[PDB]
Amino acid sequence: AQNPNCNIMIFHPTKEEFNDFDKYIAYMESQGAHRAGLAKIIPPKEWKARETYDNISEILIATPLQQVASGRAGVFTQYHKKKKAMTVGEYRHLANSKKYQTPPHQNFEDLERKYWKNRIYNSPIYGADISGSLFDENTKQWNLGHLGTIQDLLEKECGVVIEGVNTPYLYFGMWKTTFAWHTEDMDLYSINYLHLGEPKTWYVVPPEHGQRLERLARELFPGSSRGCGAFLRHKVALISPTVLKENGIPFNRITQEAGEFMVTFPYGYHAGFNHGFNCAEAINFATPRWIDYGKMASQCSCGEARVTFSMDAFVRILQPERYDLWKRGQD
Ligand SMILES: O=C(O)CNC(=O)C(=O)O
Ligand SMILES: [Mg+2]
Ligand code: NI
Ligand SMILES: [Zn+2]
């Protein structure tokens, strides 16, 4: 069995190996990369996503989100308070202000210590989930707006044509912006490219151990768990590495830098934080190996999780018994 300790693997594809996206995902899996839940892909030195980032300031962040925490430093939830619209140039100036800028630090480990000690005492503002792309149309390799769609994969595997579309999203971050513990919608893959700026630290639980994280979360968030049998779908709960280690939960950590891709694998729980002003692009995707995970994915039906149009068909075809209850949650 490849990668039996479920370590995060780092890949360096050549320019020739960078041509065929599907083939390279399957290669990484042949080496056991999915057992970690997360892999890093460093593009060949010949590749670029676009020519420059000098002309992005006029992108609008229509609904910036202030991430307000409740709880204790290692075990907390966050809610998102909507703020007034601002441009990317306005948001960058805000991120660099004395109130929001990254503090002085020695290295990534010192900054990680400061994040976990202090995060709850501040409310950073995140530009998340903005439909769009920063890849140039002429970038032919690993262009996240030109991937094979999940609807086409379901049709190729199962024979059924379905409605829906699959497009990328932009994330503009600042110091202490946080992504809560989650797996993807329908336990899909994700791919994330860090276009510019400061790093992103990730934490991940191997897919084979995801239910250990779920049991801890039910213990640590007992009101939320009574409310919803899949409350981590709400994407609000944070648990620190120290707390995970105290409770024997298997996990790994890695820091992504500008110019790097990360891939999350089906049912790989992940969480993390941004080091300072940055911009990432991400999209969900599927492969043949996903179908079995999609059929078994948990679902939130309490009303909270509320998701895209395109998840309807995935539930309806892969999970027909759950469909009626899930759709009640959506309405
Ligand atoms: O970058 C973020 O805020 C969160 N990203 C993801 O969870 C992802 O790419 O799957
Ligand atoms: Mg612009
Ligand atoms: Ni994710
Ligand atoms: Zn729910």
UniProtKB/Swiss-Prot annotation:
Annotated positions binding 2-oxoglutarate: Y126, N192, K200, K235
Entry superkingdom: Eukaryota
Gene Ontology process terms (BP): cellular response to ionizing radiation; chromatin remodeling; double-strand break repair via homologous recombination; inflammatory response; positive regulation of chromatin binding; positive regulation of double-strand break repair via nonhomologous end joining; regulation of gene expression; regulation of protein phosphorylation
Gene symbol of the encoding locus: KDM4D
PTM comment: Ubiquitinated via 'Lys-63'-linked ubiquitin chains. Deubiquitinated by USP14 with the help of TRIM14 leading to stabilization.
Ranges of residues in domain JmjN: 8-50
Record keywords: ADP-ribosylation, Chromatin regulator, Dioxygenase, Iron, Metal-binding, Nucleus, Oxidoreductase, Transcription, Transcription regulation, Ubl conjugation, Zinc
Designated name of the protein: Lysine-specific demethylase 4D
Cofactor: Fe(2+)
Record-annotated JmjC domain positions: 136-302
Modified residues (PolyADP-ribosyl glutamic acid): E16, E17
Location(s) in or outside the cell: Nucleus
Documented EC number(s): 1.14.11.66
